[PDB]
Design a protein around this ligand. Structure first.
Ligand SMILES: *[C@H](CC(=O)Nc1ccc(C#C)cc1)C(=O)OC
Length: 324
């Protein structure tokens, strides 16, 4: 599966790191009009949180070079201008956040790619979350979205809980770090470094798009904090069926070891956020942190590396869309 990456922000770069090590994915090309190849190599090699790339990174006038692999680089502001047809590109991965709708991501198909995966929520492209609704993908869909990192954390857990106990209603808080991506959000323009900063989040509503049965049943908000790029979801749900916390743990652990293996993780250890840097799960259930007040009222806690697990999911979706 031959892929090209549009945009070399943090997501674009971690997607590259993961796709390079994927045996059946070949990174063919990178486009980003705002950087030179020397800067691209620098940004790819070094990462404050996920370590130096464990391999040799260099560049020449036309490539980024990684452990012998030449990745052709381009600087096109209009993705339609890109030689995806000539380069035999199967899937274009758009990590810019600006070509995220059906009519704008179309530019990659227009350029010769067979399909597009958008690493951002879309209003028009169908959204898929691995372990949640990837079975609903059909090969005629040429442009898809991987939703958001927070939705990828919430949705697998909400599905497991809803399938086993039924979610009547849930309110969510995310304690959210300074991750990838101020006159529309006044709080967000204040200094990060010493502040807890409340914020809106559409993750709890966007779960309704990938789990229609939870449409309108979840909402929430975020407190943003100046920590490493691992965040945590705090989901307070009202359940339809009575249960015990022990039963919740067994169901989550069972899903984590079985059908959601690799997507939903499970720990009982005394973890803190930095313990999940570089974790490739979308959602790691913190069994010891949750708390049950009564048989149908529980608080569930789940961690996610807001760059790395999501980027692993992007590559997962690329392979799933290509296998179909
Ligand atoms: C996951 C990374 C992420 O959480 N970005 C993010 C989300 C909300 C806010 C605010 C306010 C800032 C940054 C991701 O990018 O999903 C694709």
């Amino acid at each position: 599966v031959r892929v090209a990456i549009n945009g070399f922000g943090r997501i674009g770069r971690l997607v590259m790191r993961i796709a390079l090590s994927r045996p059946n994915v070949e990174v063919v090309a990178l486009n980003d009009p705002f950087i030179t190849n020397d800067y691209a190599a620098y940004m790819f090699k070094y990462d404050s949180t996920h370590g130096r790339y464990a391999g040799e990174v260099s560049h020449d006038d036309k490539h980024i070079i990684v452990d012998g692999k030449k990745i052709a680089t381009y600087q096109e502001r209009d993705p339609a201008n890109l030689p995806w047809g000539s380069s035999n590109v199967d899937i274009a991965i758009d990590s810019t956040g600006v070509f995220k709708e059906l009519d704008t991501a179309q530019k990659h198909i227009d350029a010769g790619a067979k399909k597009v995966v958008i690493t951002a929520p879309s209003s028009t492209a169908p959204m898929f979350v691995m372990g949640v609704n990837e079975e609903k993908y059909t090969s005629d869909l040429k442009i898809v979205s991987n939703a958001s990192c927070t939705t990828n954390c919430l949705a697998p857990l909400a599905k497991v809980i809803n399938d086993a106990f039924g979610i009547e209603e849930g309110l969510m808080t995310t304690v959210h770090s300074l991750t990838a991506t101020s006159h529309k959000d006044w709080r967000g323009g204040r200094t990060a470094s010493g502040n807890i900063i409340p914020s809106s989040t559409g993750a709890a509503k966007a779960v309704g798009k990938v789990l229609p049965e939870l449409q309108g049943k979840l909402t929430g908000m975020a407190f943003r904090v100046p920590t490493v790029d691992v965040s945590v979801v705090d989901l307070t749900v009202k359940l339809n069926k009575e249960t015990t916390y022990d039963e919740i743990k067994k169901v989550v652990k069972a899903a984590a070891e079985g059908k959601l293996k690799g997507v939903l993780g499970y720990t009982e250890d005394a973890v803190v956020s930095s313990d999940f840097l570089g974790d490739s799960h979308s959602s790691i259930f913190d069994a010891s942190a949750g708390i049950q007040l009564s048989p149908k009222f529980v608080k569930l806690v789940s961690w996610y590396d807001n760059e790395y697990g999501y980027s692993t999911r992007v590559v997962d979706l690329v392979e799933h869309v290509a296998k179909a």
